Design a protein around this ligand. Sequence first.
Ligand code: ZN
Ligand code: ZN
Lengths: 147, 49, 16, 147, 1013, 49, 28, 196, 49
Amino acid sequence: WTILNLLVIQREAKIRNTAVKVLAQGDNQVICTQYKTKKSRNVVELQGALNQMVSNNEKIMTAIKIGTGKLGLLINDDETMQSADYLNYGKIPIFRGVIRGLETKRWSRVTCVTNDQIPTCANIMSSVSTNALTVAHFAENPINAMI
Amino acid sequence: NQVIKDATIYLYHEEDRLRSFLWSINPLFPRFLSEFKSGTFLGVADGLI
Amino acid sequence: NHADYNLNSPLISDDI
Amino acid sequence: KKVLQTMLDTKATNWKEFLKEIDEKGLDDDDLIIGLKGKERELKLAGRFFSLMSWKLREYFVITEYLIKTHFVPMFKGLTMADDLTAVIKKMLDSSSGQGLKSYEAICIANHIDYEKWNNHQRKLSNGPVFRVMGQFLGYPSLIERT
Amino acid sequence: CSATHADTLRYKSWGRTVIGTTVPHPLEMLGPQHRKETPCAPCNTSGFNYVSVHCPDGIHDVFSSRGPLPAYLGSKTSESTSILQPWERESKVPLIKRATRLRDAISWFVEPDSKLAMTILSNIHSLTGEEHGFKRTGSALHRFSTSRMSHGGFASQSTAALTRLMATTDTMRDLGDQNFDFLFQATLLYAQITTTVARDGWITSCTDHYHIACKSCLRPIEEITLDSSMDYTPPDVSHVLKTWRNGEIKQIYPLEGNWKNLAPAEQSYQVGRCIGFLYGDLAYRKSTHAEDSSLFPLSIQGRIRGRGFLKGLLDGLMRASCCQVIHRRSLAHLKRPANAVYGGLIYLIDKLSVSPPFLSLTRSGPIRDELETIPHKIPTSYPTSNRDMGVIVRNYFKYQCRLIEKGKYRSHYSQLWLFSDVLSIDFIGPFSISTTLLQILYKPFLSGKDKNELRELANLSSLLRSGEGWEDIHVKFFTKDILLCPEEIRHACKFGIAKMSYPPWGRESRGTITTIPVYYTTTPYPKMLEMPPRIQNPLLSGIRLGQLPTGAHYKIRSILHGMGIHYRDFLSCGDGSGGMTAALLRENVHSRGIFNSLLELSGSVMRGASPEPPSALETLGGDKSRCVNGETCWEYPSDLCDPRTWDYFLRLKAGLGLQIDLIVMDMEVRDSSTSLKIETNVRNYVHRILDEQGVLIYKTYGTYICESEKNAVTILGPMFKTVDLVQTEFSSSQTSEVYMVCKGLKKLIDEPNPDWSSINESWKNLYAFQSSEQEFARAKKVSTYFTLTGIPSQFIPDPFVNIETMLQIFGVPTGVSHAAALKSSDRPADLLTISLFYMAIISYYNINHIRVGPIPPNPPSDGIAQNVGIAITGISFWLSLMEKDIPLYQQCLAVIQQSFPIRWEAVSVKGGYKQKWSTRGDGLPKDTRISDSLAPIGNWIRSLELVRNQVRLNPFNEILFNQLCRTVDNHLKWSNLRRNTGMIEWINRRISKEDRSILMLKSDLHEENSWRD
Amino acid sequence: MSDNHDASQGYSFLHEVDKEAEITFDVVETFIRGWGNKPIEYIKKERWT
Amino acid sequence: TKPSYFQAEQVEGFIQDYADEEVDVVFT
Amino acid sequence: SMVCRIDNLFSEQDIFSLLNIYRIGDKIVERQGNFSYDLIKMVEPICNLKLMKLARESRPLVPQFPHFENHIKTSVDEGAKIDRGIRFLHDQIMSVKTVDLTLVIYGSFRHWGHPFIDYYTGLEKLHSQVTMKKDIDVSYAKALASDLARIVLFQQFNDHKKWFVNGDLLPHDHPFKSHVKENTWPTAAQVQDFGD
Amino acid sequence: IGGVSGMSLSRFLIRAFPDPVTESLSFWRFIHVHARSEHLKEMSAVFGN
Ligand SMILES: [Zn+2]
Ligand SMILES: [Zn+2]
């Protein structure tokens, strides 16, 4: 089904003649439309260019909506998230291009053993070890993780 | 299951000979022994265990 | 040992 | 039932003849049985469920998804299934470009899409031929469209 | 040592020593960091054995942006596991592929004629009824795996900081002579993470070193061989295992050869051949491996010849192009196969001239020394951007391909060689086969036997790449006596180096100056100066033919000659790539100098390569030692605001002397704060660097003066004895660029206030206030001068190759541009007609107004319309300069200011549709704006004047014009260009005044660079 | 989030945690002073009451 | 005196391969 | 994990903000019981709505994307007709000035508990949304299948230099009979005449 | 190295380093070298032996 959705996206993007990056694991999909322009002479022209950018973006999104409707799949346009300085994929925020890790979700699992696992000298410490490693992977200067 | 049955039979019969053949090599290269143990029929049982 | 120690199952109001 | 006990108790499934029969005549009505069990740690009152397929259906779905993952998924950029952490980071960096630059000469616009029951609104008439192509390329036409 | 302790502990554990397990960690092998501002003691006891990490903007204000630099994440190896998908299972490998991969070790650390390999084959014969191979040597043992892939190391850190560093792995050359077992990836990642934690709150530039501390954990690799004395014959289990088993036929066995006695040039040729053929095979496959670092490792820069390597690369690309034409063209309609081969070769070269891992190899080394033997243009930028290096690559391969189009080409070495990195049937087959395809296709025409052979060869390629065998018929096509080299690519060219001079530099050209003085007295006068306009036009920038990195050295030489300025040594800060520095060096051969420039890294990718030195020092050749910091300027601060830069300058002066007698501050600043900080810095450091009789030259603009209250005049003027503001003859036409010259240092200051009232009577003598005619006159006066004097031919692009590549940029084909350029040398006495012909063919190949197709043509696009206006105005400048067309010059200026008119339409006629443009109608507006593209507008004038060489020109003749045009298309002539394209409408001063332009947009992807070694 | 009982064992447990963490913090301090060049100091959770 | 010539949507798309006719070798 | 860090991100005031959010959610859970998680479920969306507007400050000239904002506003106005508490829960999350606190809240949707699932309604809604009757354009699916086939054939030809179709079964007047027998690929102009 | 749980800090530098036996030993030697007390030295010389 993800392959089907990607075929839809590729077809409609080529029809629109629009460049698009795509991230997908199934129901959650991010379709990033990319644009570039030149140095502006004033702010009015820049704002008009941005208006045309968002116009082309909603055009391709309407095309993808129509495609999924022809296939029998809905896209709630009132819940679609649009932003030019923020991204989200797999419950992993990306703020101004920088990837950020949710540290608290990892420390909240301290002493919380997994399925069919007794609290043990070896098991209870993994709960902190794995989470500290995960916190350090998605964080700069891994000094707080050690403490 | 004739597959797993044959695999565990080979294990019970052909594990103490392969161990000696692997330990008989003079320059000990453990990763080679691991990949050989995994690239043979006994690997059918380990993956199950 | 043969029991759970953390929430790893759905929460149902049919036994209480 | 558990998978390992059933494997050790049932015959060894010959995948060639298994797929052959699946392709020629499908399955019987005795193996077409799907259970359900609620999901854990969900904030919804309605309730999302698991999917306990039968032995034959489980093997069919698993091996077919393995084939899809091994062969067709690499052709498409976006399916972050075979990927690993570093590849996901590379892709999220490529897609996140044009974000946080203090300039308008290069702008990305993400589109996070919400599908109304993406997994339930699938229909045979929308993914028949797209799966028949897969079955052709695998030597078993009318294999994957039988879902 | 931790490695030795681990080894002996495993020895005590398992009773006997082990191998291919122990790996030294970078925590003691490298140890803590050694910052460069500190004297960095271990940089004296040893040489290139370290990892450098540079941070041009510190580690401050993270999470507020991405960062300009790419990120090194780790190894290309996959992990087979991801926390982001725990529900997934571990990616395993089938037993048949884990058992058949053991043959990789068949002659790597075992022996074929042994009791072990026999068992390895007995295993395969056991689990499958399917019943001696290649050679491997010179690789590590712990980098061997079948059930998985050797990782090497991945990052444990976010990208927000990694995007603000650049590491260097080419600083470990001394360890490259040997084949140690440590890992490059882990070392670079340790370097990155430690440099991030140790310099978190740093806001200025930084450079850190990681030198080998514990030399004991180097552990050179040895050549070990495994063997047993016992027989293990596993019983057959094929008959009991076909259930889950679902379902290697032929393989060529190359011979070994005497690789040692082969000369270095042939070794370079062979490695280049293999690399080129593999790159072509992968590019025609459209794979991602083509953009990997293994194809072009940086570990062979200083251990490879240039000519041989590049000739081999050319031969390999050609052979690969020969093995694609059969799979693209149809032999029935095919004719002139050499044209198709040359086209595929051009395709491969244009795709390789944009490859990061290749341009890094050719960015600095003997390869680049060979690339620069050919005449060319010096790069204008600090460390060469990928496009400025691709230009050099294209120029070199275009010089080397000019003999191919003559029809005479042949491989310099009939015998072939192979390596372990390209050891596979999918490479060996087509590589062995290309020897026949070359002879069959490069020849002019075909015959029936040739077509039959090519069809059989296409079928054979299909059979080889598809893993299928071949009959006993194809043997005549294979290559006989193909050899092999045991070592890999980056461990085979292990030869030495053999044998500098100074090229002939005569008296370069000079010009006169225009000076206005400023006197200082306590009386504060009013600051009354009319601001000059900010006008731009490249006319004189196009006149200057001696295109060293910029046309600025004319100005510095003019000032030096026109004010009596002498200097033993000098300090040049602000130049791009050593242009003005090289000028000052070559004008005084007995002169050492200090070089400072800001390190640009945005448009320059580096796969672990250190920033090269400035390119303009190639002007000296082997005399680079006079620039004391030419090869070390990048590991130190460069910003002229940071006092640490001037501290570094004083440290150089102290440790070497140089009795400095000149300082030149030439730069283009973008904000007043930066200029004010630079001025406050040079206030507090000039007395310690400069002598009492020293000289200072500070570039600035009258606009920044009239605008800002505090500037260089109010700051640096008083402290010096004599001060003047000078403009030059070789200066831009209309500009406020003035050089503040200051001779003599005062002891104490009693004259801090200038006298602006004695500047108003001369502030109007600047060129910006003068009209366009008074500058056109000076442009003609300067064009008569021989600006190209005293410059060898090694540092000038050839005019006829220059115009060729320029037309090739502007939509024009390759051979058409070749012929149109040769036609300029055929009779330069009438070059106006030929320039108008260039304009005609450019506007024809960008906007075809003759071809009548069925579909209505799509309207023009950006780049297809921008090049039209660029070429038109750039050639109109030259036409006006050559025929005194002042109104056309003013028109060019105006369109540079407002826009370039273009008005498009599509007319319906028999055939159905043909496009048509002009510059007056109300048609579809494609009116483009050209204000950030003056450099091409000047390059056109430069090329045309290089062609002319002061020769007198004949008038314009429409007869020869149409004669030239008919060589491109019969319907193309001066008549058709008057009513359907509006070029005559342009030249004859009839255009649209209303600027109908708009800001351009496009849905183009964003190029985010990153990699995994 | 109620405060209608005696949290004595909580204070005891947290105090013991801080006391036994200040002991083992020397390893982290040493590693960061060596690897990095930024000495640090332990901070009890009781600083913010 | 005079020269020797005298009369008597808003966003562009993303896409706008090989070349064998643009070249011609010679022999002998 | 947010007290007295070497990286002085979080102060005590931020922890007071977090605990006030917890108290608001707990009051909602006190008034409404298992029917409160229809409202707490809107914690992660609002956080995202707070991130965009924070990300938009550095580049504010871009036009707004008011769909998600209006959806959150409408859902909050509807939920306020049940429990006013969420109207506060939406106003205090927008009052945060930093991103780290917003992330601490985004990773805290599970810090208010879980409900007793009513599997009856879930099974009913599953049977409903599954058996919905759909209107489908089969030609679009045929087109997507043709696109998949083109992709697969192009890749496998670039790799193996071979077509994976049969020329014997193929007609003699087909434009892809010559390219198959002799290994070749059509021209981009020749493929447009064979669309879908 | 004779452990049960409680990984070392050197694993915060490289994610998937092949040899942990050398990671831990390098870590403990680093501690013993940059330590400021004898209880750490006598302990780092024991975990590695
Ligand atoms: Zn050591
Ligand atoms: Zn050093």
